[PDB]
Structure formats: structure tokens, C-alpha cells
Design a protein around this ligand. Structure first.
Ligand code: CLA
Ligand code: CLA
Ligand code: CLA
Ligand code: CLA
Ligand code: CLA
Ligand code: CLA
Ligand code: CLA
Ligand code: CLA
Ligand SMILES: CC(=O)O[C@H]1CC(C)(C)C(=C=C/C(C)=C/C=C/C(C)=C/C=C/C=C(C)/C=C/C=C(\C)C(=O)C[C@@]23O[C@]2(C)C[C@@H](O)CC3(C)C)[C@](C)(O)C1
Ligand SMILES: CC1=C(/C=C/C(C)=C/C=C/C(C)=C/C=C/C=C(C)/C=C/C=C(C)/C=C/C2=C(C)CCCC2(C)C)C(C)(C)CCC1
Ligand SMILES: [Cl-]
Lengths: 59, 214, 50, 450, 37, 163, 34, 33
């Protein structure tokens, strides 16, 4: 699972990095779309915690 | 409150009540009644100020602790314990470790200084019980402008203000320092001279011998 | 030579004599600069006030 | 775009970052983003080295540059410098990567959407480059942070598993430094000693006790200084000798960091204590001493009377006398007689290299260590051919000591150059003639002829 | 070698360390995009 | 029941019916309870650490049984005579029902803002001390079993300088 | 040769202190514009 | 099959083109480049 879990984490981090820099710049874009970014941030930290829990347990 | 710079002090802590009025009073027990706590010779009359009573408390503590500092250095450094006892090296000069010095000295001199400070506080209460208005740390005659003893204090009111500042500050800092020295010696079983002098030296383990060169 | 040495003073004479030169300089410098406490210029490298 | 054009600013695109001198928020964003870049490189390189790790070879043969630090801290290392596991390095790498992501986001936010000037909205993080109280406050805050970090290292070495100590009895291993040296005289003897041969200004720290004590002292000094600068204000004597502007502060920092870089470069080239030879490989002098030692042993096996064979010049080809009288190895390696290595100290007495110990009490592990160090000297080429410049290319090795020393020496000098440039420009700009002369108030025409 | 879980993700690590250099260049390409204003 | 007792960790931590209902009918009682518990457990932690370096030289049963010899930690409970701890508690219970010393009066003024903040901080600290007492007792008993079952032998696992 | 060391140690501290206190004597003010 | 080569080229790949993609999008959406 770990391997997969992380794969995801890599994919979601790529999707976040390609879109955060474009957001901030584009004037206004930010605020309007703030809650989805917050939700994706929570997803990201949840994925990190899940990966850490995998390892630990698996060792 | 500039002492506790990003904080508020008591709803009524004063700035001119005591010289040391920078505002440092975080829990600020000044607020609390600070009265004849457990009947501390209650008067209900002038009774000074509860803050001023805490001020007299700090003054007594800091003065005693200030004298205590010198009594932790001079037994070692200054006078190198001039105990010069007629006999009995123990309870005399020999114990240069202040804790051990107390451990030895007979209750004769203990009761001597005990009765000394006893008469001191007896006269202090004799003044203060009547010395209402400004209790002014139970000043009475002790080196006051009237100078109840030799070299009767001869200074100016601005010099007196600065002198009040000097005393108060030194007493507070010495209240820190006495704690310092005591916990030091107890947690090292020595006297301040011991650790400070090997410190300012070079350890015997490494000395590069001497210049025995040709 | 390789004897470590605080600074390089080996003889109390050497330290006590490297002393008066620095103190002589401190005195000549103090001759101009004395009794200075305030006069904050508050500017970019001004120090205009003597 | 008001602040981002040669017109509005007066600064060309190539010198574009100078437009942020008076912009507080964007400068903070740039600084934070750059710190994120540092952290990202650290994590990425640790992960790279862990990936390319090979358990057969020692770390100094694999071209590694970061595993050595974490091993010296006492992570996944066993007796003799053997690497047990590489899990803590992986953990450090991933933590650094995540933290770098956070820092990079913060830097981007503060550079793009953050307010340009922090003075208006947050009058606690705003500054002026000209008032001294706020500058000293920031300096003191960061100084306290540095002191806390030095404490953290001391705490790690004393009560958090300990650190790796080569001079430990029974060989190098992780141990707790129970009794660090706290004597101010011995600690500051390093600071105030000569930087020449036989002295080693701060590079010549020998035991771990001195390292821990010096770090305790540095942390205490930094904490006290940080508290002191926060409260006080620059004095009169320092108020008229310093240029008070952002570029001047940058130039001061550049000079200081160039000195630090030079010190670290020369520190990685000579030190065995904080740079164990089992991880970074032998130093320059160590390889030469190892060669002399191994050939002495080999010639002694044949039955030749060592310490009695005159050399070609009549000086003695195995044992000599140092200019101070100490007994040392002969040959060209007499210049390196100041060496002190854990594998050669057992043979040293108060008079120098003891002869009875050499003749009788020699050890096979010393022979193996000397042979390995001689066969791996800090010699190489840019393409990492390894060995002497005239050697054919079969081995592939350049010691990490050489890489570290060369790279950091280069960086240190170029930061000294940066100090020169920025100090000159800052003082000229403060004076007010950094753009030209005047053409109507030329000071040369107002001065006496000569 | 990486732990067995991440040996699959090894190739990303093979390129991760050289990222920063490219950031630098990005500055230059960004300046080129805005006509070296 | 969303009074004082909440902060950034949770705006009202009660993942059950417990909070809702008995509205100001058990909430005040639970505040009394949690207060007393957290205070006592704070005193517990201070208890454990202070016997490790200091020791008052009083002879609990005169002639013998001097503090300097009794084990610190759980053992003391086995050591301390049943009736001895009964008398100690009887003093404590009299104290609870007489206010004898222990600041019998005097709480200063503390305007309602600072007063509320101090009370909240108190609650939080005592809550934390409950968990601290928990870990301590755990380690103690576990070691008492297999001498170093936990591993780290010395009683106070953190604060290594002490032990 | 201790005398020679003494004389050189003087000369060196002499000139070094001259430098240090010359640059401390409000040097940035010394300048064409004021 | 040196899957290592087919794994190491395409990742260098995605990474090298990514930031320039960010530049694409910023210039397209009339951003404050
Ligand atoms: C689900 C339960 C669980 C378990 C069993 C573990 C177990 C472990 N974690 Mg862990 N962790 C967990 C949840 C868990 N964690 C959660 C929820 C988080 C927050 C997201 C973390 C965050 C975390 C960090 C940040 C770190 C650990 C580390 C560790 C290891 C340190 C002990 C050690 O060196 O042993 C010996 C173990 C090994 C030699 C191999 C591992 C250990 C294996 C540390 C670690 O792995 O360092 C090596 C470390 O740095 N954990
Ligand atoms: C570490 C290097 C570094 C950093 C931190 C900065 C930072 C900055 N520069 Mg800059 N610069 C640099 C190197 C750097 N520069 C170099 C090397 C040059 C020479 C070519 C310049 C030349 C230069 C000029 C000429 C100017 C700046 C300006 C600026 C400021 C505003 C930039 C702006 O508006 O972006 C706008 C650009 C974009 C929106 C496009 C970039 C898109 C993002 C930011 C790229 C990174 C995305 C990242 C990979 C995604 C990570 C997401 C995260 C969540 C993981 C900003 C503080 C300007 C200034 O003075 O501001 C007042 C200005 O005029 N710089
Ligand atoms: C922490 C260190 C530091 C900081 C914060 C600054 C900050 C600054 N410097 Mg500066 N500088 C430094 C160190 C530093 N410098 C050092 C060490 C030197 C000596 C070389 C200089 C020499 C220097 C000069 C000569 C000038 C500045 C200038 C400036 C200002 C604008 C710079 C700018 O826009 O960058 C823009 C950045 C670039 C254009 C990037 C150029 C890339 C270089 C040339 C190549 C780097 C090679 C690299 C190591 C590897 C290449 C990899 C490649 C093969 C792919 C700014 C205040 C300018 C100024 O006066 O402003 C007032 C100016 O003219 N600096
Ligand atoms: C050296 C690092 C540093 C410094 C000095 C600052 C400083 C600041 N940040 Mg900040 N920030 C940082 C790193 C830093 N940040 C990082 C790494 C991130 C990413 C996690 C952020 C994310 C961030 C956000 C999202 C916001 C700030 C904001 C602010 C400003 C107000 C902060 C505040 O109220 O704190 C009060 C603390 C003590 C009094 C202040 C200028 C705020 C701002 O300016 O916008 C209004 C804001 O909304 N920061
Ligand atoms: C990064 C480290 C650092 C830096 C940049 C500074 C910077 C400064 N210090 Mg310093 N200081 C530091 C660490 C540092 N301090 C520490 C750790 C201590 C404790 C020993 C001190 C103790 C100290 C004193 C006692 C004095 C300075 C003074 C000064 C100022 C003049 C420096 C000079 O002429 O020499 C300058 C602002 C002088 C000054 O102007 O006082 C405000 C001064 O008298 N410093
Ligand atoms: C010792 C027993 C005890 C008692 C009687 C209470 C009683 C109470 N707790 Mg509580 N609490 C306790 C232990 C206790 N707690 C411990 C050990 C923790 C740490 C896990 C907490 C953490 C906690 C939180 C985080 C909150 C309460 C809250 C409350 C109140 C409503 C439920 C009530 C006064 C809530 C409240 O005051 O509203 C609330 O937000 N408690
Ligand atoms: C034996 C006398 C005595 C009496 C009558 C009470 C009486 C009471 N206790 Mg109590 N208590 C006592 C001793 C006593 N306590 C002791 C010795 C402790 C341990 C220090 C506690 C610890 C305690 C807590 C933690 C709580 C009460 C709560 C209560 C109330 C329910 C009630 C008023 C709940 O609020 N008690
Ligand atoms: C500064 C000295 C110091 C050192 C070296 C340690 C060292 C240690 N502490 Mg520790 N600790 C300290 C001070 C220290 N502590 C203080 C002052 C506190 C009170 C906040 C704690 C509270 C503490 C806890 C609560 C725990 C540790 C734990 C630990 C251990 C693993 C981390 C380690 C032996 C852990 C074992 C653990 O659970 N410590
Ligand atoms: C007629 C008559 O009788 O009226 C009297 C009135 C009166 C007022 C009595 C008079 C007077 C004036 C008096 C008596 C003034 C007395 C003042 C006094 C005696 C003031 C002590 C301060 C000591 C301090 C602050 C602490 C220092 C030391 C500190 C804080 C340390 O740091 C100690 C440190 O040690 C540790 C902690 C550890 C070591 O590792 C390091 C060091 C060593 C650095 C007269 C003139 O006699 C007349
Ligand atoms: C402002 C500006 C700039 C700058 C910027 C910056 C500097 C930024 C930074 C940024 C950053 C600094 C970022 C970072 C990021 C990071 C990340 C994003 C990370 C991630 C991670 C991950 C994803 C991981 C994963 C993993 C794991 C977990 C395990 C193992 C495997 C792996 C490794 C895969 C420039 C110059 C451009 C231009 C101008 C403007
Ligand atoms: Cl040779």
C-alpha cells in the first residue's frame, strides 16, 4: 500500500504545484477559489499522515 | 508595563508608590489585600499601603540578602576568614565553605546575631507601630537625614532620590545573587573561590610543560 | 613556537608592554571623543553631528 | 509595473533584485523562498545518496557528501565506522523535502500576494534600514535562535544518543560525552592561538569534550548577546563608524560569511575529530604518514634494523628527529610531523614515536588501516580519474575532503569579492556619488595643486 | 538502496537533486517572457 | 454549555451526549470535578520529580521509617502503612472541609478578562497533568514488573540529568 | 632576542591601533560632500 | 530492457518541461507575470 499511497501523494503534489503558482499570480483568482485549495491542502496532509502511519506500522 | 513590555499590569498598580515602579507585577499580588495576613500586627489605622507593606518586605529581604552576599565572599576572599579565634580552629576561620561554617559555629554566636537582629526588628516594630503616615521602610533613625548614628546623613533630596534607587536596585539584584551563591555552594560542596580560581587558570592536565628550550 | 599560547604572549613583559601602545591610542582617541551620550542623527550613515 | 521596470526603478533587468531594497514584504518573500530552496536541496541530495548507496564500499569511496555528517551525528553507524542501516538518512531526507515544500509556498505567497511594505499593515515586522533599535532587535532575535541551535547540538551529543567519537577506547563508536570541558582558558585558547603550523587556530580541536564545551560556550554567548542587543541601542563609538543602510549590512554579512567559508574549507582538510577519517577518508598528511608507516613495517618484516638505516642523504629514511626533538617518520613526510591520528597514537610516547612499541607491539589492524589510507589519498582529477596525475585511469575516486575544501574555498573568496564590491557601493551611495561626479562640483578642482 | 517500498519511486529521486539549478534558469526564461523589461 | 473550557484544539470536545443535557445542571459539577482532578494530578507530577533529588529528613514512624529510605514511585504506596495513609488523608479531608492554610483566603482581584484567561489556562494545565500522571504510573508499574520491560530503566524517562 | 620580539610587538600594536582608531574616528563623515 | 533509462529520461523529462508549462499558463491567462 505504501508504494501506492505515495504514488498518489506524488500525483496530488504535482497537481497542486502546477496550479498554485498559476493561481496566486492571476489577479483575484485566489480568493474566489480558496476553499477548494484548503480542501486539497487537507487532503495532502492527510496523505502524508497516512504514509507515515503505513511505514511505522510496517516496521 | 515596560518591564513586562507586551503586558498589562494590575488595574491599579502605581508608578510612583515605590521607586521600583517599572510596572513589573505579572501575577501582581499587589492587587490582593496584602493586609495583616494571618494577623500581621493589624492596625486598621494608617496601616501604610498594602503595596507599601510589600515594599517594606522586599526592602528587608534585599538588604539582608545583600549583606549575605558579602558574607559569602569575604569569609573566603576578603580577610580569608579572619576568625583569629583564641582556640578551636573548627567553628572559626577553618570552615571557609559557608554551609560548613554554619555547620560548625556554636550556638553562642548564633544566639548573638539572633538577638542582634532581634533587637533590630524590635526597634523596627517600635518605630513602625507608631511610624504611620509614611512608614518609609520603617526608616526611623537608621542613617536617616537626622542620622541617628555617626556621620549623620548629609545629602540632597535629589541625591536622596538617587540613593533610594541605589538601595532598592542593589537589594533586588542581591536577592538574585544570594540564591545564586547558595545553590552554587550546596551543589558543589565548595566555596566560590574554588571554582572561580581553577576556572581562571589552565588545567594541570595540559600545560605544555615549560619552556625548557635551549 | 608551536606552543599554542594565548595570543602569543610568552613573557609577562611582552603583554605588559603591548599594553601601553593600545592604551596610548585609547587616550589620544578619548581626547577628541569624551562626554558623548546622545545626538542620534537617525539617517543613512550621516554621523554629521560631531 | 511600478517597481518592476528600469524606468520606475532605475535598475536594469540583470541587476533586478536591487529593486527590493526598499520593499519589505517582497524581500521577505524572496528570503523565505531561498531558504526553502536550501532545504529542498538538502533533502533531495540525502535521498539521492541513499538511493545510490552500496554497502560494500566505505562512504568516502562512493562520492558521498551528506551521509558523512549524519553518521558523525551518530545515526546508523556501528563500531569502526561501519554503516548498519540507512533508514534515519531517508527519514531526514523526507522531512527536509516536506519542510521545503512548506517554505517554498510561504516564500511564493509573500513575494506575489503579500503586501509590498510590511510597515503599514504590520507595524512589528516593518523596518527602515535607518533606525538602529529595530535592526538590533532582529539581530538579537536571530542570535537567540542560533544559540538555541548550538544548545540543541550539545544536548544531542550529551543526552540524545551521543555522537561518533574516533578517539573512543576500543575504536570509533557512538558514545555519550558525559564531562565536557568548561574551562574558559582551554576553550578560548583555540580562539586566541596562532593560525600557523603546529597551532591550527580552530581546526586543531582534538577530543569531543572540547567540541562540546566550545558549543556550550558559543550557545551561552549567543543567548546573552541576543538578549543584550534586543534591549540596548548602539553606542556612540559604534554610531559614527558604521554605514547604516541595507547594502552595508549585506556587505558586513558577506565579509563574515567569507571568513566562515574559508575556515570551513580549511577545517575539512585537516581535522580528524569532527571529520572522522573512516567517513571522509584520510587527510592530506594522513596519507603520507600512512605510506611511511606501511613501508616501515614492510621493511621491518624482512629483518632490517629500523631506526638505524641511514637514508640517501644520511638523514634517516624511517625515523627522524623533529626540529623540536620529537621522533617522527622520515622522508618528505617530515613536514607533517604535527599529525595525530587514532591509529598512530597507540605508538606515540611522551618522547614521540616510541621505538619499543614499533619493534614489538605492532597490530594487524593498524597495518590494514595504513594500507587502505595510502591506497586512498586525497589525490584526483576533475574527471575523477584518481591517483597521481601521471597514473592511468582504472580507479575512479576523488576524496570528499578535496571536493569540500576546493568548493568552499572558491565560494569563500568570491564572497570576499562580494564584500568588497558591496561595501564600496554602499559607502558611495550613502555619501552620494555612486552615479557620477557632478560636472559642476568636481572636488578635484577645489583642491590645492601638487 | 532505498527501502523496498520506494525502489519503484527511485527514478524521481534520480532527478530530484538537480531541480534547483533549473529554478535559476526559470528566472531567466521568465525575464525573457516579459521582454527583459 | 459552551462556557469556559474550550480553545483552539476543540470548540467543545464532547464526542458523546455527555455535554448536551443537564445544561448548567451537571456542567458546573463537572467543572468542579475536572478542576479538582487536574490540580491534584499536577501536584502528583511535582511529587514524583521532587523526591528524586531532595528529601526531607523526617522519621514518619519515630525511631525508624525515615523518608530518606522509603522508595519513590508506586512502591511508597505498598510501603506507607494503611492507617498511616488513612491519617494523611484524614488531614487532607479536614483541609477540604476547613480550608486550613493552603491559601485559606486571598485570591486578589483579577478583572474578569484576565480572570477568565487564568481559569482557562488552569483547566488546560491540569488536564495535561492528568495524562502526565498516567504515563508516569504506567512506566513505573511496567518496570516494576520486568525490571526494564519498557527499556529505559531510570524512573523519570525524560529529565535524564536527574537520574 | 626577547628584546627584538618586544620591539616588534610594540611596532605592530602601535600601527594596528593607529589603524583601528583612525577608522573609528568618524571616517564616513570624512567625504567630499560634507 | 534498461528500464532504468526509460525511467530516468522521462522523469527528467516531466520535470524539465513543468516550470515552462507554468510560464505558458501565466502568459496565456494574462497574468501579472
Ligand atoms: C501508526 C503507528 C505508528 C508507529 C508504529 C510508528 C513507528 C515509528 N515512527 Mg512514526 N508516525 C506516526 C505513527 C506511527 N509511527 C504518525 C501518525 C506520524 C505523524 C504523521 C508519525 C511520524 C513520524 C516521524 C516524523 C518519524 C517517525 C518515526 C518512527 C520510528 C521511530 C522509532 C524507531 O527508530 O524505531 C526503529 C525503526 C527503524 C529502524 C525503521 C523505521 C518508528 C518505527 C521516525 C523514523 O522513522 O525515523 C527512522 C521519524 O522520524 N514517525
Ligand atoms: C532565489 C532567487 C530569486 C528569488 C527568490 C527572486 C524573487 C523576486 N524577484 Mg527576482 N531575479 C532572480 C532571482 C530571484 N528573484 C534572478 C536570478 C534574476 C536575474 C534574471 C532576477 C531578476 C528580477 C527582476 C528583474 C525583478 C525581480 C523581482 C523579484 C520579486 C518579484 C518577482 C515577481 O513578481 O515574480 C513574477 C513572476 C512570476 C509570477 C512567474 C514565476 C512563477 C513562479 C513564482 C515560479 C516558481 C513556481 C514554483 C516552481 C512552484 C512551487 C509551488 C509550491 C507550492 C511548491 C521577488 C521578490 C521583481 C521586483 O523587483 O519586484 C518588485 C523584478 O522586477 N527579479
Ligand atoms: C547573499 C549574498 C548576496 C546577496 C543577497 C546579493 C544581492 C545583490 N547583489 Mg550581489 N554579489 C554577491 C553576493 C550577494 N549579492 C557576491 C558574492 C558577489 C561577488 C561575485 C556579488 C557581486 C555583485 C555585483 C557585481 C552586483 C551585485 C548586485 C546585487 C544586487 C542585485 C543583484 C541581482 O539582481 O541579482 C541578479 C542575478 C543574476 C543576474 C544572476 C547571474 C548569474 C551569475 C552571473 C552566474 C552564476 C553561476 C553559478 C555559480 C553556476 C552557473 C550554472 C550554469 C553553468 C548553468 C543585490 C542587492 C548588483 C548591484 O550593484 O545592485 C545594486 C551588481 O551590479 N552583486
Ligand atoms: C521568516 C519567516 C516569516 C516571516 C517573518 C513572516 C511574517 C509574516 N507573515 Mg508569514 N509565512 C511564512 C514565513 C514567515 N512569515 C511561511 C513559511 C508561510 C507558509 C506556511 C507563511 C504564511 C503566511 C500567511 C498565509 C500569512 C502570513 C502573514 C504574515 C504577516 C503577519 C503574520 C502574523 O500575523 O503573525 C503574528 C505572529 C506574532 C505576532 C507577517 C509579515 C499574513 C499576512 O501578511 O497576510 C495578511 C498571512 O495571512 N504568512
Ligand atoms: C552575529 C553576531 C553579532 C553581530 C553581527 C553583532 C553586532 C554588533 N555588536 Mg555584538 N555581540 C554578539 C554578537 C554579535 N554582535 C554576542 C554574541 C555578544 C555577547 C558577547 C555581543 C556583545 C556585544 C557588546 C558588548 C557590544 C556589541 C556591539 C555590537 C555593535 C558594534 C560591533 C563592533 O563594532 O564590533 C554591532 C551592532 C557594541 C555596541 O554597539 O553595543 C550596542 C558593544 O558594545 N556586541
Ligand atoms: C478528570 C476528569 C474529568 C472531568 C470531570 C472533566 C469534565 C469536563 N471536561 Mg474534560 N478532560 C479531562 C478530564 C475530565 N474532564 C482530561 C483528562 C482531558 C484530556 C484528554 C479532558 C479534555 C477536555 C476538553 C478538550 C474539553 C473538556 C470539557 C469538559 C467539560 C464538558 C465535558 C467538563 C467540565 C470540554 C469543556 O470544558 O467544554 C472541552 O472542550 N475536557
Ligand atoms: C475524606 C474526605 C473528603 C471528603 C468529604 C471529600 C468530599 C468531596 N470530594 Mg474529595 N478528595 C479527597 C477527600 C475528600 N473529599 C482526597 C483525599 C482527594 C485526593 C487529593 C480528593 C479528590 C477529589 C476529586 C479529584 C474530586 C473530589 C470531589 C469531591 C466532592 C464530590 C465532595 C465534596 C472531584 O471533584 N475529591
Ligand atoms: C534539556 C535537557 C534534556 C534532555 C537531554 C532530555 C532528554 C530526553 N527526554 Mg526530556 N525533558 C526535559 C529536558 C531534557 N530531556 C525537560 C526540561 C522536560 C520538561 C518539559 C522534558 C520532558 C520530556 C518528556 C515529556 C519526555 C522526554 C523524553 C526524553 C528522552 C527522549 C527525547 C530523552 C532521554 C521522552 C522519553 C518523553 O516522553 N522529556
Ligand atoms: C549610620 C548608619 O548606620 O546608616 C547606614 C546606612 C547604610 C545604608 C547601611 C550605609 C550604607 C551603605 C551600604 C551598607 C551598602 C551596601 C551594599 C551592598 C552590600 C550591596 C551588595 C550587593 C551585592 C549584589 C547586588 C550581588 C552581587 C553579585 C552577583 C549578582 C553575582 O553575580 C555573583 C556571582 O556569584 C555568582 C552568583 C556566581 C559566580 O560564579 C559568578 C558571580 C561571582 C559573578 C551606611 C553608609 O553604612 C550608613
Ligand atoms: C519568487 C520567484 C522565484 C522563486 C521561487 C521559489 C524560490 C520557489 C521555491 C519553491 C520550492 C522550494 C518548492 C518546493 C517544493 C517541494 C515539493 C513539491 C516536495 C514534494 C515532495 C514529495 C512529493 C516527496 C515524495 C516522496 C516521498 C514522500 C517518499 C520518497 C519518495 C518521494 C521523494 C517521491 C523565481 C526565482 C522562480 C522567479 C521570480 C519569482
Ligand atoms: Cl618520502
Amino acid at each position: 500500500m505504501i508504494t501506492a499511497l505515495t504514488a498518489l501523494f506524488v500525483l496530488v503534489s504535482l497537481a497542486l504545484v502546477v496550479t498554485v503558482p498559476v493561481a496566486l499570480a492571476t489577479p483575484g483568482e485566489w480568493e474566489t477559489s480558496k476553499d477548494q485549495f484548503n480542501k486539497i491542502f487537507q487532503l495532502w496532509v492527510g496523505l502524508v499522515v497516512a504514509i507515515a502511519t503505513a511505514d511505522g506500522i510496517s516496521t | 508595563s515596560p518591564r513586562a513590555l507586551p503586558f498589562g499590569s494590575a488595574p491599579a498598580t502605581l508608578d510612583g508608590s515605590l521607586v521600583g515602579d517599572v510596572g513589573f507585577d505579572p501575577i501582581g499580588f499587589s492587587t490582593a489585600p496584602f493586609a495583616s495576613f494571618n494577623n500581621p500586627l493589624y492596625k486598621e489605622g494608617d496601616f501604610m499601603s498594602d503595596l507599601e507593606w510589600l515594599r517594606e518586605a522586599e526592602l528587608t529581604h534585599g538588604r539582608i540578602a545583600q549583606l549575605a552576599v558579602l558574607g559569602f565572599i569575604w569569609p573566603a576572599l576578603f580577610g580569608t576568614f579572619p576568625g583569629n579565634e583564641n582556640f578551636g580552629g573548627a567553628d572559626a576561620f577553618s570552615y571557609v565553605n559557608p554551609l560548613e561554617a554554619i555547620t560548625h559555629v556554636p550556638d553562642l554566636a548564633i544566639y548573638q546575631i539572633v538577638g542582634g537582629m532581634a533587637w533590630v526588628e524590635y526597634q523596627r516594630v517600635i518605630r513602625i507601630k507608631e511610624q504611620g503616615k509614611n512608614r518609609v521602610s520603617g526608616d526611623i533613625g537608621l542613617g536617616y537625614p537626622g542620622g541617628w548614628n555617626p556621620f549623620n546623613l548629609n545629602y540632597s533630596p535629589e541625591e536622596y532620590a538617587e540613593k533610594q534607587l541605589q538601595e532598592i536596585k542593589h537589594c533586588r539584584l542581591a536577592m538574585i545573587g544570594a540564591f545564586g551563591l547558595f545553590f552554587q555552594a550546596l551543589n558543589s560542596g565548595t566555596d566560590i573561590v574554588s571554582q572561580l580560581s581553577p576556572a581562571f587558570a589552565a588545567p594541570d592536565y595540559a600545560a605544555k610543560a615549560g619552556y625548557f628550550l635551549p | 613556537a608551536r606552543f599554542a599560547n594565548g595570543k602569543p604572549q610568552s613573557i609577562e613583559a611582552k603583554y605588559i608592554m603591548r599594553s601601553p601602545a593600545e592604551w596610548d591610542r585609547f587616550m589620544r582617541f578619548m581626547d577628541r571623543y569624551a562626554e558623548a551620550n546622545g545626538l542620534g542623527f537617525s539617517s543613512x550613515x550621516x554621523x554629521x553631528x560631531x | 509595473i511600478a517597481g518592476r521596470d528600469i524606468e520606475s526603478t532605475g535598475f536594469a533587468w540583470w541587476s533586478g533584485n536591487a529593486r527590493l531594497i526598499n520593499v519589505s514584504g517582497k524581500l521577505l518573500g524572496a528570503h523565505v523562498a531561498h531558504a526553502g530552496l536550501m532545504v529542498f536541496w538538502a533533502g533531495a541530495m540525502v535521498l539521492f545518496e541513499v538511493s545510490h548507496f552500496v554497502p560494500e564500499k566505505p562512504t568516502y569511496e562512493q562520492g558521498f557528501i551528506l551521509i558523512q555528517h549524519l553518521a558523525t551525528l551518530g545515526y546508523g553507524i556501528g563500531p569502526g565506522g561501519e554503516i548498519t542501516s540507512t533508514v534515519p538518512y531517508f527519514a531526514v531526507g523526507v522531512i527536509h523535502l516536506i519542510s521545503s515544500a512548506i517554505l517554498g509556498f510561504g516564500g511564493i505567497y509573500h513575494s506575489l500576494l503579500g503586501p509590498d511594505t510590511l510597515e503599514e499593515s504590520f507595524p512589528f515586522f516593518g523596518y527602515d534600514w535607518r533606525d538602529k533599535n529595530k535592526m538590533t532587535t532582529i539581530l538579537g532575535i536571530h542570535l537567540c535562535l542560533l544559540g538555541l541551535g548550538s544548545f540543541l547540538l550539545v544536548i544531542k551529543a550529551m543526552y540524545l544518543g551521543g555522537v561518533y567519537d574516533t578517539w573512543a577506547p576500543g575504536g570509533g563508536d557512538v558514545r555519550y560525552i558525559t564531562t565536557p570541558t568548561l574551562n574558559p582558558i582551554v576553550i578560548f585558547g583555540y580562539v586566541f592561538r596562532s593560525p600557523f603550523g603546529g597551532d591550527g587556530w580552530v581546526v586543531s580541536v582534538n577530543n569531543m569534550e572540547d567540541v562540546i564545551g566550545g558549543h556550550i560556550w558559543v550557545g551561552i554567548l549567543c543567548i546573552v548577546g541576543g538578549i543584550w542587543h534586543i534591549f540596548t541601542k548602539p553606542f556612540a563609538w559604534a554610531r559614527r563608524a558604521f554605514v547604516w543602510s541595507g547594502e552595508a549590512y549585506l556587505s558586513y554579512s558577506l565579509a563574515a560569511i567569507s571568513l566562515m567559508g574559508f575556515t570551513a574549507a580549511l577545517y575539512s582538510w585537516y581535522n580528524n575529530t569532527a571529520y572522522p577519517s573512516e567517513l571522509y577518508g584520510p587527510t592530506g598528511p594522513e596519507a603520507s604518514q600512512a605510506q611511511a608507516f606501511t613501508f616501515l613495517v614492510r621493511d621491518q618484516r624482512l629483518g632490517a634494523n629500523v631506526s638505524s638505516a641511514q637514508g640517501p642523504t644520511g638523514l634517516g629514511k624511517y625515523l627522524m628527529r623533529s626540529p623540536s626533538g620529537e621522533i617522527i617518520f622520515g622522508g618528505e613526510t617530515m613536514r607533517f610531523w604535527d599529525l595525530r591520528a587514532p591509529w598512530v597514537e597507540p605508538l606515540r610516547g611522551p618522547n614521540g614515536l616510541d621505538i619499543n612499541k614499533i619493534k614489538n607491539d605492532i597490530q594487524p589492524w593498524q597495518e590494514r588501516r595504513a594500507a587502505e589510507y595510502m591506497t586512498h589519498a586525497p589525490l584526483g582529477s576533475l574527471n575523477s580519474v584518481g591517483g597521481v596525475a601521471t597514473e592511468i585511469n582504472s580507479v575512479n575516486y576523488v576524496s570528499p575532503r578535496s571536493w569540500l575544501c576546493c568548493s568552499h574555498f572558491f565560494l569563500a573568496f568570491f564572497f570576499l569579492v562580494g564584500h568588497w564590491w558591496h561595501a564600496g557601493r554602499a559607502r558611495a551611495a550613502a555619501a552620494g556619488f555612486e552615479k557620477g561626479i557632478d560636472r559642476d562640483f568636481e572636488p578635484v578642482l577645489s583642491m590645492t595643486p601638487l | 538502496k532505498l527501502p523496498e517500498a520506494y525502489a519503484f519511486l527511485n527514478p524521481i529521486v534520480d532527478v530530484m537533486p538537480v531541480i534547483p539549478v533549473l529554478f535559476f534558469l526559470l528566472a531567466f526564461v521568465w525575464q525573457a517572457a516579459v521582454s527583459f523589461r | 454549555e459552551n462556557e469556559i473550557g474550550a480553545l483552539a484544539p476543540t470548540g467543545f470536545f464532547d464526542p458523546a451526549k455527555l455535554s448536551d443535557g443537564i445544561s448548567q445542571e451537571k456542567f458546573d459539577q463537572y467543572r468542579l470535578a475536572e478542576l479538582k482532578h487536574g490540580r491534584a494530578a499536577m501536584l502528583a507530577v511535582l511529587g514524583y520529580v521532587a523526591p528524586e533529588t531532595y528529601r526531607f529528613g523526617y522519621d514518619l514512624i519515630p525511631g525508624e521509617l525515615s523518608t530518606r529510605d522509603i522508595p519513590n514511585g508506586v512502591a511508597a504506596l505498598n510501603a506507607i502503612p494503611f492507617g498511616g495513609w488513612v491519617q494523611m488523608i484524614a488531614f487532607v479531608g479536614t483541609v477540604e472541609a476547613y480550608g486550613w492554610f493552603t491559601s485559606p483566603t486571598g485570591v486578589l482581584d483579577l478583572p474578569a478578562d484576565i480572570l477568565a484567561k487564568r481559569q482557562t489556562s488552569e483547566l488546560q494545565h491540569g488536564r495535561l497533568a492528568m495524562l502526565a500522571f498516567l504515563e508516569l504510573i504506567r512506566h513505573d508499574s511496567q518496570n516494576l514488573a520486568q525490571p526494564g520491560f519498557d527499556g529505559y530503566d531510570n524512573l523519570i524517562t525524560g529529565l535524564p540529568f536527574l537520574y | 632576542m626577547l628584546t627584538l620580539k618586544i620591539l616588534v610587538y610594540t611596532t605592530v600594536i602601535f600601527f594596528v591601533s593607529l589603524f583601528i582608531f583612525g577608522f573609528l574616528s568618524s571616517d564616513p563623515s570624512r567625504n567630499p560632500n560634507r | 530492457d534498461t528500464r532504468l533509462l526509460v525511467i530516468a529520461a522521462p522523469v527528467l523529462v516531466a520535470a524539465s518541461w513543468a516550470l515552462f508549462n507554468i510560464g505558458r499558463l501565466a502568459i496565456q491567462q494574462i497574468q501579472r507575470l
